[PDB]
Amino acid sequence: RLNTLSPAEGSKKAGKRLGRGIGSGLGKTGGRGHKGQKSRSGGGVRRGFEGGQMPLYRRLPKFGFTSRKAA
RNA sequence: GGUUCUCCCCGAAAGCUAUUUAGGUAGCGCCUCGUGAACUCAUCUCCGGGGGUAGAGCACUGUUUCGGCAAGGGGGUCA
Numbered sequence: 806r807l808n809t810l811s812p813a814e815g816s817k818k819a820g821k822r823l824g825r826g827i828g829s830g831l832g833k834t835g836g837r838g839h840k841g842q843k844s845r846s847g848g849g850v851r852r853g854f855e856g857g858q859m860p861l862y863r864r865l866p867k868f869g870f871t872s873r874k875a876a
Numbered sequence: 877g878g879u880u881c882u883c884c885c886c887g888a889a890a891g892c893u894a895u896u897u898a899g900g901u902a903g904c905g906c907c908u909c910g911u912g913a914a915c916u917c918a919u920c921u922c923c924g925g926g927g928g929u930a931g932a933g934c935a936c937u938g939u940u941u942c943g944g945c946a947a948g949g950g951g952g953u954c955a
């Protein structure tokens with residue numbers, strides 16, 4: 806009867822909402838520590854960056870060639 | 877610098893490694909949630925082990941104080 810309809814158990818998961826008091830658990834720093842590049846807005850680092858060490862996908866040598874006949 | 881409602885469960889780290897790196901970041905180490913298997917792990921008993929630290933010692937590496945024998949050396953004496 807329209808108002809009687811409810812979803813399955815565990816279907817909806819609420820979702821994390823950050824910065825909303827202490828009781829919320831997460832709140833004041835939205836689960837992202839104190840300071841550093843990761844805490845800052847637009848933070849983090851690009852994909853495959855090991856902090857100036859030459860990343861795995863450059864220290865290893867490239868190999869082979871893509872065949873046109875294989876496609 | 878600041879990041880706003882509430883209860884319940886578990887709960888770190890400030891280490892290694894690398895870095896124009898050192899107040900940053902990454903992988904591992906430590907937290908957590910989830911998913912499966914073996915007596916898997918922990919505590920203590922009685923066995924098997926390797927070590928070369930504490931201590932001790934002076935054959936060796938050097939160092940060191942005495943006493944006994946003593947080549948070899950330092951002072952003297954000749955035609």
Ligand SMILES: [Mg+2]
Nearest residue numbers: 821829830831
């Ligand atoms: Mg939550």
Ligand SMILES: [Mg+2]
Nearest residue numbers: 821829830831
């Ligand atoms: Mg929470």
Ligand SMILES: [Mg+2]
Nearest residue numbers: 829830831832
């Ligand atoms: Mg918390």
Ligand SMILES: [Mg+2]
Nearest residue numbers: 834839840878
């Ligand atoms: Mg702050």
Ligand SMILES: [Mg+2]
Nearest residue numbers: 839840841899
């Ligand atoms: Mg800090």
Ligand SMILES: [Mg+2]
Nearest residue numbers: 838839840841
């Ligand atoms: Mg941080």
Ligand SMILES: [Mg+2]
Nearest residue numbers: 857858895896
């Ligand atoms: Mg460099």
Ligand SMILES: [Mg+2]
Nearest residue numbers: 889890891898
């Ligand atoms: Mg440190």
Ligand SMILES: [Mg+2]
Nearest residue numbers: 889890891892
């Ligand atoms: Mg420490």
Ligand SMILES: [Mg+2]
Nearest residue numbers: 897898899900
């Ligand atoms: Mg550092």
Ligand SMILES: [Mg+2]
Nearest residue numbers: 841898899900
């Ligand atoms: Mg810095």
Ligand SMILES: [Mg+2]
Nearest residue numbers: 928929930931
């Ligand atoms: Mg010692």
Ligand SMILES: [Mg+2]
Nearest residue numbers: 929930931932
């Ligand atoms: Mg000793």
Ligand SMILES: [Mg+2]
Nearest residue numbers: 931932933934
């Ligand atoms: Mg002694």
